[PDB]
Amino acid sequence: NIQGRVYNFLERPTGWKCFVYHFTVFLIVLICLIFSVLSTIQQYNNLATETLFWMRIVLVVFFGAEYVVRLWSAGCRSKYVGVWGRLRFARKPISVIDLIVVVASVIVLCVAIRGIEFLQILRMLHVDRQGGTWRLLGSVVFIHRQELITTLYIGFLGLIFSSYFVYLAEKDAIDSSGEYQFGSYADALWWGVVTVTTIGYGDKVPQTWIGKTIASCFSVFAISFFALPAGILGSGFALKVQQKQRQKHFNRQIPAAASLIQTAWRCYAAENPDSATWKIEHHRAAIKVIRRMQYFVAKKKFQQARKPYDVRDVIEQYSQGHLNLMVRIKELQRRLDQS
Amino acid sequence: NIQGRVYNFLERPTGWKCFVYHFTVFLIVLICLIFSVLSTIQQYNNLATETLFWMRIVLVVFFGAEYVVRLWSAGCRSKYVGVWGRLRFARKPISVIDLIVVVASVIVLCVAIRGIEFLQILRMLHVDRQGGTWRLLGSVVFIHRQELITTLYIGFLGLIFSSYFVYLAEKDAIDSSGEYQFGSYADALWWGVVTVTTIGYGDKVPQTWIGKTIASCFSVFAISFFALPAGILGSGFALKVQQKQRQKHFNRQIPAAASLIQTAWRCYAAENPDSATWKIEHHRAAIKVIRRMQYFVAKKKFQQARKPYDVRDVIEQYSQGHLNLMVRIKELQRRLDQS
Amino acid sequence: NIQGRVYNFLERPTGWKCFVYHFTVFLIVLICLIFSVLSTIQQYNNLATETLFWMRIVLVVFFGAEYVVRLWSAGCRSKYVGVWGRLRFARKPISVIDLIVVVASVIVLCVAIRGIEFLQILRMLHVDRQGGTWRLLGSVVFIHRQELITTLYIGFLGLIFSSYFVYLAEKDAIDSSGEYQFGSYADALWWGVVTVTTIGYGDKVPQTWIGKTIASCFSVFAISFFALPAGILGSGFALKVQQKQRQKHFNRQIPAAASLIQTAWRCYAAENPDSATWKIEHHRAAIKVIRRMQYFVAKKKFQQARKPYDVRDVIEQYSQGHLNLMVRIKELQRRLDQS
Amino acid sequence: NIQGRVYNFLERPTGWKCFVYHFTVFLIVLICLIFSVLSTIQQYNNLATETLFWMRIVLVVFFGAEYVVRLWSAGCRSKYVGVWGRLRFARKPISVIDLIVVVASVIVLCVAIRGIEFLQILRMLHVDRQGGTWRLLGSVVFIHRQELITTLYIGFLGLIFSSYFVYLAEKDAIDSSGEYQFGSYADALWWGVVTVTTIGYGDKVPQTWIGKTIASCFSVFAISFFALPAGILGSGFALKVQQKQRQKHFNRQIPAAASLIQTAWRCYAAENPDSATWKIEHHRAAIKVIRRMQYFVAKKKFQQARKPYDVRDVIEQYSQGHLNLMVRIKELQRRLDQS
Amino acid sequence: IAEFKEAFSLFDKDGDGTITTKELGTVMRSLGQNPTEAELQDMINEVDADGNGTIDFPEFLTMMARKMKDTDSEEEIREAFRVFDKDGNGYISAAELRHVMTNLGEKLTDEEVDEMIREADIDGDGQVNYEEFVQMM
Amino acid sequence: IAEFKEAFSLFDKDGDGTITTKELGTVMRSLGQNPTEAELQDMINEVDADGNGTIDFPEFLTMMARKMKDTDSEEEIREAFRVFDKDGNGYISAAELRHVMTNLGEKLTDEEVDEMIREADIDGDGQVNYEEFVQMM
Amino acid sequence: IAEFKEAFSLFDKDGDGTITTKELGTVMRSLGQNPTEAELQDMINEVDADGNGTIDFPEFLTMMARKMKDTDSEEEIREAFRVFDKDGNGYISAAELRHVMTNLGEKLTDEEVDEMIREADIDGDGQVNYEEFVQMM
Amino acid sequence: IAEFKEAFSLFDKDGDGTITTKELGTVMRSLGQNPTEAELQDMINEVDADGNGTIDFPEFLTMMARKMKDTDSEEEIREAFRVFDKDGNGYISAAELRHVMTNLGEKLTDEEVDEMIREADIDGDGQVNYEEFVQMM
């Protein structure tokens, strides 16, 4: 249908055909920013006023039209069909930004506000529509919560305890220009946070040899505790890249998928006494238990059916094959033993 | 029992119910710090004295009450039951900090001491009770001791040998403000430790082209030898994260666990001649040897039973199954060969 | 042939015999640079003019001779044989640099041009001829496109949003020398890009406590998002190093390789009705379908034949062997069942 | 023997018993350094002269005695037994440092020399005797030569090409103190090498917006190319740590080891016609070929016998077992087929 | 409340108090299912928790007390339905559903498929909203 | 257009609408090929997409409509030729080609090799440009 | 001191100086244990160090001289006890212990369980401190 | 020069120009070695390079022309000797060497061990410098 095609163009992009449109809005709003700066520089007044107003109203009108068109076209998915259900789509966190940008542009055109003109850049800045990037980053951050937490905690403790001692050592030391640069603990904490992240502006440096010794013994050990989170996440991404290439083909999931729904519906229909499923008193009870076992087995199999290959499959496969061969070996031995 | 529930609340936390209490103490002591700062600023004297004293005694009383309640409630575990055994719990390194904080608060309330008021923050700073974070970090650090040691050693050697040559080259160079900044080896070592960690305050920079050449050839090679420990530990954490997800289920350890204790107790009871274990002269000796073999086999099996899957299990399983099938194949061949 | 030997010496180097030649050109052109600098210093005029001209014409003549010799010798490969085909070799991106260097040297000798003398260093700088290094780096960068893109995007968003707030907080703060260092958003963005990469020149530092708080809360979180790409690529290289050592031997590819071409040519010859391949009406149709199946199977097998070992091969091998044994087990059972 | 015990104490250390001795020399020479500094400060002259001379001669005498004792005790190993063979041990690179230190101390005691007093620290600095650390680092560096080389090359090219353009843009820009800081390409290259390693002293910063744009576009991309080598080597160490824990037990190498030497000696003895190995004309030729095949098989097996477990062993083991079972299956079928 | 034991004794022919794989196989012969040995072994494992390979009565009530209505199962059923969606919008052609459920997996009888389809397709033509079909089960 | 069904019925002896491995094996006996069971199983898998292990007619037209002329296949054939090049310049000695195609892999008849070689070696002596041989097929 | 050889000759029926798997199996028949082939193979491996698959006499004294009382074994036994603790405090209900040691693993006789339990539970009711039971063994 | 073919025809009973595993097995029966099938298969693989599982004559001369004296083999033999050194100094007790070479691996005859030992131990008592024994072979 044409509605689905429109939805697949505004959202869920395919490539160049939507890319040109994205690029054009991208550059036109940057032109808007440069033109607002030019009007601030107070160039030829007539142009810098009238054409700025023209292209501002053009931009806000286009933005509202795109928003309403996308809101209508979002009805292709069953989750958002209907008037009362579309409020859920309007509640999506990404879509709120577009409304905020539209209302901010409307208010600006009607009229710090000078910074509010920059707030409109919010929409263009967020260009990833399906949320793939944030969705990818969130899982990796969530998996490694404990080691990030512990290293941040250790770094914080080291920072505080080291920054206190240098303040103690450097309390009464004057500078060349005659100004106490370590007069209070607030200055020492600022020095600690500038130094533990290897920035080192140079506005505050220790001057007494005691403070120099403490800083030298501190920084070398404490820098790694803050450099750790980058390495942890980098290796986490790199390892998952390997798993992304050793996935099972789509052809191995269809049978288990069909079996799961079939056995689930059979379990559901077992609740009624007159459904045709009885065509296959006491047996009517055992049948339910057997069906429940089958449903659990099917669920486990489906869960296994969409995971990358693992040695556990080899270990279970060997035992299954060994039993399958063994039963026939004993059956043949017993059959031959009759004579 | 209620005692176990109290112990499971003060220690070994579960979640939000203890989290609210932890948060309240967390913020109230920060309020105490901000109020001590306000009293230092010398605000309205009556409030800043009396309410400060009030909430100080409140805090120390609450701290002592919590300490004594936890000390009593620690009797749930068999390792700490009894008067003489509870001294071991009181000897735990974490619990010493609470006593130190309590006595420091008592001394402060009775009365650098201005810094001793900060020492109380020790308790809140250490909020991880079970020691999980330090326990996790310790194993990872311990496994990789050799490569950390060698890289730190190489970095130290490079630092010393490079910092000496720049001191030699820059001994007699004056600055713009007419002050020798490289007048002695102590200054050169300070420059080396500020430069090899990529901080670069800018208080001391080489000025003669010889020193510039040495520094340029030095830093590029030597920075990596200090950046290494972060990457090593990050990758170490990331690799262990993979192993944490490929663990055997708890259902595969119960049989081996039971068998281990059973065979160990059988070996122990073999020492007595009248125990019922003889119900199954020379045979009484061979029985002990067989039981010892069984105990060793059970120990090895239990050790294997709680490790992540490894190709070695596949290699041993295939050989075991091959032997099991082979013996029956030869038995059937021999049985058929009789005619 | 001698032409192939010349091609294998100018390109596709083997080692020391070409290495000495590469080293000699390497050092002689550096001598040329140092001599041009000496002539700039205006040493003894006669030498610095005449010998400079001598060795300049020597260098350009040698460069042209090498270029023409390589262009002729590139005819060993079938892709470049023939006059009309050699234009493709001349179109190779690496070879364009040599022509650019030659024409630039010719123009310089005939005569910013002072910087154009440096442009000649282009040739020596690019010394990797087969393109192995860039080819290696490109695959690793291409595989990890998504995680690099998302982290760069997040870093950019954080940089912009943090640099705006510090500009807002620091708009009207004067410095010690009475000069607004944060007078406009351009200065704030420069500070942000100097600070988020942990360089920290120290030309611009925040002075009001609000800006200090924003910078402290910003840098700690935002530094990792820019430190990530190094770790990602490092781990990507390290993982591929492991795969490079677990490759199948060259002896396992010859049979599949021969079979692929054999079955492809058989499928091609099936199109003619009088070829000898019919020596092996309706059968002439089924034969084509069988040959197409065989060609597809051979292609799949050849694709599998040049990949590192993977558990999937074990999983398929076990099933194949199990079927091969099972069919004979049932055949023996059926044969024995006749009596 | 006592000589072996002495060798195992001076070299190849075991632990604390040699550790105390190492610690004592370690601290005593640091005492020597601090005392030389004290004598430089010109304290009480009599002590600072006489006791310094005393402990200097004490140190040099002890050093010579230790050197000669170790040189004698190095005769335990067969590689160094004999007068003419011990020169090889004296040629060991580590042992040269001890002789250099001894002769330098002798020369100093007989008498920049002030820096030569520091040269003695060479011995204590090198405390790893077996060379384990350097041996470990060398293999890891050697394995990853290509990716380190390419990234260093790319970083160098980027550094040069970026540092030239900023020099072009900043040629004629004056500073606040009226001094061209970018007057020549040497200054620009120094700025480039200070900036591409994220040090940032702040002695030279670009001032024109063109140079600012170039630096901003340069640093962000070029910093990763220099941060890469740390991550590469860190991940390389971490991966090898995993392989170090999945090694085959020492019990699986003895049979292959014995078989290798046995078959090698059999091949050697096959060269003589009267050795007892003939006890097992034309057959005397085929025997040699069979023995050569056996020797090659034994060598391959021994090479495989000391590697960590790999899927290839599973793949070969399954095929071997399948053939072993298959031959007996066909033999039983043929035997039964006789009736 | 604990009436399930009445069914348990049905599976416990020998009366030793546990259900073995042979008991399951021999009771399921009476209904003409004709199972496989590996199938019976796999079916048994999804209940046993002791690891001894035999079903205990407390584990039997533990299994029987497990409720089907829960997010962990509704999500899996939804994913299994989604696997078969050609476009992901949440609609399936009725003919494709009938063909799939008749030929793939374990084949259902025609009348079962008709009964299942009659409970659906009430919306209109041959589009079936599986996201409301899921809540029915 | 869809004439392929005429050949399909040739493979579908039982007429149920699908091709089983037994049908493939029994039809290929008539031509005296004598296949293996594992070979037949592997051959069947390269067409089936349902995963049920049986060839469906729409999958049959899907396979038959696949075109050979494409980069993904020309590159693989070129790599297979390159594997046998002793120097990589893009030339092969005719005698080596004949020996390889007679003895390695599945052995061809001599007359087939002669017919194939006659289509090549037109350039001159026993160097054969495989990069133009590839485009012929 | 080296009296163990007197027992060794009991296992060495053939007198060649080594114990083979067949010797172990045939001597253990006399006590009515009825072992398995794989069980015997696994039992043999825990003593042999040469890798030849046969038990040597010096290895026999090496095994017999190994002492049970040591941290490496006490920790493992403590962990095996801890696995069965429902709360980790260091207490086990006596009925659960009896049920576990009668039904799981290799089943003990009732009188052995009674004798073992009598040595414990001296503290009071059916809580047994396994951390003091461990030191007894 | 190429006299090796005279031995090759000894292994090539059928005369087709290649050596099969059956030929190797049947010729090695004449010397009373009694090999295994897997042993013969493994022995064959160390020469074949075509991957067809059959030994070709050019590969036969390629194998026969391989020289034993080389660093890659001397290092491996030295490591195999070092594995058995109890202290690593480069000395082995003669009795241990005799016991090892009589009982472990493939057992040698006593006279072979005596002949090998006589070529060594010339230095003195029962210490044998294997680093000079290696160069002899």
Side-chain angles (χ1 to χ4, degrees), chain A residues 216-231:
Chain A
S216 300
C217 298
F218 148 67
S219 54
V220 174
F221 277 79
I223 283 169
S224 304
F225 287 109
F226 278 88
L228 269 205

PDB file of all heavy atoms in Angstrom, chain A residues 216-231:
ATOM      1  N   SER A 216      53.247  12.884  42.489  1.00  0.00           N
ATOM      2  CA  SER A 216      53.945  11.896  41.674  1.00  0.00           C
ATOM      3  C   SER A 216      53.544  10.475  42.043  1.00  0.00           C
ATOM      4  O   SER A 216      53.369   9.635  41.154  1.00  0.00           O
ATOM      5  CB  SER A 216      55.455  12.074  41.813  1.00  0.00           C
ATOM      6  OG  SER A 216      55.852  13.370  41.399  1.00  0.00           O
ATOM      7  N   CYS A 217      53.396  10.184  43.336  1.00  0.00           N
ATOM      8  CA  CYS A 217      52.981   8.841  43.731  1.00  0.00           C
ATOM      9  C   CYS A 217      51.501   8.603  43.450  1.00  0.00           C
ATOM     10  O   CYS A 217      51.067   7.452  43.325  1.00  0.00           O
ATOM     11  CB  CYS A 217      53.288   8.610  45.210  1.00  0.00           C
ATOM     12  SG  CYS A 217      55.043   8.705  45.627  1.00  0.00           S
ATOM     13  N   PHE A 218      50.715   9.674  43.348  1.00  0.00           N
ATOM     14  CA  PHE A 218      49.273   9.543  43.168  1.00  0.00           C
ATOM     15  C   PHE A 218      48.910   9.307  41.706  1.00  0.00           C
ATOM     16  O   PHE A 218      48.239   8.321  41.372  1.00  0.00           O
ATOM     17  CB  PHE A 218      48.586  10.797  43.714  1.00  0.00           C
ATOM     18  CG  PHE A 218      47.324  11.181  42.991  1.00  0.00           C
ATOM     19  CD1 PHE A 218      46.196  10.380  43.042  1.00  0.00           C
ATOM     20  CD2 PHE A 218      47.265  12.362  42.271  1.00  0.00           C
ATOM     21  CE1 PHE A 218      45.039  10.752  42.387  1.00  0.00           C
ATOM     22  CE2 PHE A 218      46.113  12.732  41.612  1.00  0.00           C
ATOM     23  CZ  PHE A 218      45.000  11.926  41.668  1.00  0.00           C
ATOM     24  N   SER A 219      49.356  10.205  40.822  1.00  0.00           N
ATOM     25  CA  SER A 219      48.855  10.222  39.450  1.00  0.00           C
ATOM     26  C   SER A 219      49.152   8.914  38.728  1.00  0.00           C
ATOM     27  O   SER A 219      48.293   8.372  38.021  1.00  0.00           O
ATOM     28  CB  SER A 219      49.458  11.403  38.690  1.00  0.00           C
ATOM     29  OG  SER A 219      50.872  11.394  38.775  1.00  0.00           O
ATOM     30  N   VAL A 220      50.368   8.387  38.905  1.00  0.00           N
ATOM     31  CA  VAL A 220      50.791   7.197  38.171  1.00  0.00           C
ATOM     32  C   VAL A 220      49.851   6.030  38.432  1.00  0.00           C
ATOM     33  O   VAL A 220      49.487   5.296  37.504  1.00  0.00           O
ATOM     34  CB  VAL A 220      52.244   6.841  38.541  1.00  0.00           C
ATOM     35  CG1 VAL A 220      52.649   5.523  37.903  1.00  0.00           C
ATOM     36  CG2 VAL A 220      53.184   7.956  38.120  1.00  0.00           C
ATOM     37  N   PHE A 221      49.439   5.838  39.682  1.00  0.00           N
ATOM     38  CA  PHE A 221      48.518   4.763  40.022  1.00  0.00           C
ATOM     39  C   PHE A 221      47.072   5.103  39.675  1.00  0.00           C
ATOM     40  O   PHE A 221      46.308   4.221  39.273  1.00  0.00           O
ATOM     41  CB  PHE A 221      48.635   4.420  41.510  1.00  0.00           C
ATOM     42  CG  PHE A 221      49.764   3.482  41.829  1.00  0.00           C
ATOM     43  CD1 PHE A 221      51.066   3.945  41.907  1.00  0.00           C
ATOM     44  CD2 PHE A 221      49.522   2.138  42.052  1.00  0.00           C
ATOM     45  CE1 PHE A 221      52.107   3.084  42.199  1.00  0.00           C
ATOM     46  CE2 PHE A 221      50.557   1.271  42.345  1.00  0.00           C
ATOM     47  CZ  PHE A 221      51.851   1.745  42.418  1.00  0.00           C
ATOM     48  N   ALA A 222      46.674   6.369  39.825  1.00  0.00           N
ATOM     49  CA  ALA A 222      45.252   6.685  39.743  1.00  0.00           C
ATOM     50  C   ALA A 222      44.778   6.910  38.313  1.00  0.00           C
ATOM     51  O   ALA A 222      43.570   6.862  38.057  1.00  0.00           O
ATOM     52  CB  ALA A 222      44.936   7.908  40.597  1.00  0.00           C
ATOM     53  N   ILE A 223      45.691   7.161  37.371  1.00  0.00           N
ATOM     54  CA  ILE A 223      45.263   7.429  35.998  1.00  0.00           C
ATOM     55  C   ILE A 223      44.628   6.195  35.363  1.00  0.00           C
ATOM     56  O   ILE A 223      43.655   6.304  34.601  1.00  0.00           O
ATOM     57  CB  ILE A 223      46.456   7.953  35.176  1.00  0.00           C
ATOM     58  CG1 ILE A 223      46.714   9.423  35.508  1.00  0.00           C
ATOM     59  CG2 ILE A 223      46.215   7.784  33.686  1.00  0.00           C
ATOM     60  CD1 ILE A 223      48.013   9.950  34.955  1.00  0.00           C
ATOM     61  N   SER A 224      45.149   5.006  35.674  1.00  0.00           N
ATOM     62  CA  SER A 224      44.632   3.785  35.065  1.00  0.00           C
ATOM     63  C   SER A 224      43.195   3.511  35.492  1.00  0.00           C
ATOM     64  O   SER A 224      42.390   2.999  34.702  1.00  0.00           O
ATOM     65  CB  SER A 224      45.533   2.604  35.422  1.00  0.00           C
ATOM     66  OG  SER A 224      46.870   2.855  35.030  1.00  0.00           O
ATOM     67  N   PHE A 225      42.855   3.824  36.745  1.00  0.00           N
ATOM     68  CA  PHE A 225      41.505   3.570  37.230  1.00  0.00           C
ATOM     69  C   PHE A 225      40.459   4.405  36.504  1.00  0.00           C
ATOM     70  O   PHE A 225      39.281   4.034  36.507  1.00  0.00           O
ATOM     71  CB  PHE A 225      41.426   3.824  38.734  1.00  0.00           C
ATOM     72  CG  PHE A 225      42.096   2.768  39.558  1.00  0.00           C
ATOM     73  CD1 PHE A 225      43.278   3.034  40.226  1.00  0.00           C
ATOM     74  CD2 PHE A 225      41.544   1.504  39.665  1.00  0.00           C
ATOM     75  CE1 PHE A 225      43.896   2.061  40.984  1.00  0.00           C
ATOM     76  CE2 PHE A 225      42.157   0.527  40.421  1.00  0.00           C
ATOM     77  CZ  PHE A 225      43.335   0.806  41.081  1.00  0.00           C
ATOM     78  N   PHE A 226      40.856   5.516  35.889  1.00  0.00           N
ATOM     79  CA  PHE A 226      39.945   6.275  35.046  1.00  0.00           C
ATOM     80  C   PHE A 226      40.090   5.938  33.571  1.00  0.00           C
ATOM     81  O   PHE A 226      39.154   6.174  32.800  1.00  0.00           O
ATOM     82  CB  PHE A 226      40.154   7.776  35.251  1.00  0.00           C
ATOM     83  CG  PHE A 226      39.445   8.326  36.453  1.00  0.00           C
ATOM     84  CD1 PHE A 226      40.055   8.329  37.692  1.00  0.00           C
ATOM     85  CD2 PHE A 226      38.165   8.837  36.342  1.00  0.00           C
ATOM     86  CE1 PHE A 226      39.404   8.834  38.799  1.00  0.00           C
ATOM     87  CE2 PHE A 226      37.508   9.343  37.445  1.00  0.00           C
ATOM     88  CZ  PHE A 226      38.128   9.341  38.674  1.00  0.00           C
ATOM     89  N   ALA A 227      41.241   5.406  33.157  1.00  0.00           N
ATOM     90  CA  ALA A 227      41.390   4.976  31.770  1.00  0.00           C
ATOM     91  C   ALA A 227      40.720   3.631  31.506  1.00  0.00           C
ATOM     92  O   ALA A 227      40.503   3.272  30.344  1.00  0.00           O
ATOM     93  CB  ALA A 227      42.871   4.907  31.396  1.00  0.00           C
ATOM     94  N   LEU A 228      40.398   2.883  32.559  1.00  0.00           N
ATOM     95  CA  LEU A 228      39.805   1.555  32.397  1.00  0.00           C
ATOM     96  C   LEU A 228      38.489   1.517  31.618  1.00  0.00           C
ATOM     97  O   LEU A 228      38.355   0.647  30.737  1.00  0.00           O
ATOM     98  CB  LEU A 228      39.604   0.923  33.782  1.00  0.00           C
ATOM     99  CG  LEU A 228      40.725   0.060  34.360  1.00  0.00           C
ATOM    100  CD1 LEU A 228      40.164  -0.933  35.363  1.00  0.00           C
ATOM    101  CD2 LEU A 228      41.465  -0.659  33.258  1.00  0.00           C
ATOM    102  N   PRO A 229      37.492   2.377  31.886  1.00  0.00           N
ATOM    103  CA  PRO A 229      36.182   2.201  31.231  1.00  0.00           C
ATOM    104  C   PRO A 229      36.229   2.227  29.715  1.00  0.00           C
ATOM    105  O   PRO A 229      35.421   1.547  29.072  1.00  0.00           O
ATOM    106  CB  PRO A 229      35.362   3.374  31.782  1.00  0.00           C
ATOM    107  CG  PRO A 229      35.978   3.677  33.085  1.00  0.00           C
ATOM    108  CD  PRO A 229      37.445   3.463  32.882  1.00  0.00           C
ATOM    109  N   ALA A 230      37.140   2.997  29.120  1.00  0.00           N
ATOM    110  CA  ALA A 230      37.254   2.992  27.666  1.00  0.00           C
ATOM    111  C   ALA A 230      37.686   1.625  27.153  1.00  0.00           C
ATOM    112  O   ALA A 230      37.077   1.083  26.222  1.00  0.00           O
ATOM    113  CB  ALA A 230      38.237   4.070  27.215  1.00  0.00           C
ATOM    114  N   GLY A 231      38.728   1.049  27.753  1.00  0.00           N
ATOM    115  CA  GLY A 231      39.185  -0.260  27.320  1.00  0.00           C
ATOM    116  C   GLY A 231      38.140  -1.339  27.522  1.00  0.00           C
ATOM    117  O   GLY A 231      37.957  -2.207  26.662  1.00  0.00           O
TER     118      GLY A 231
END
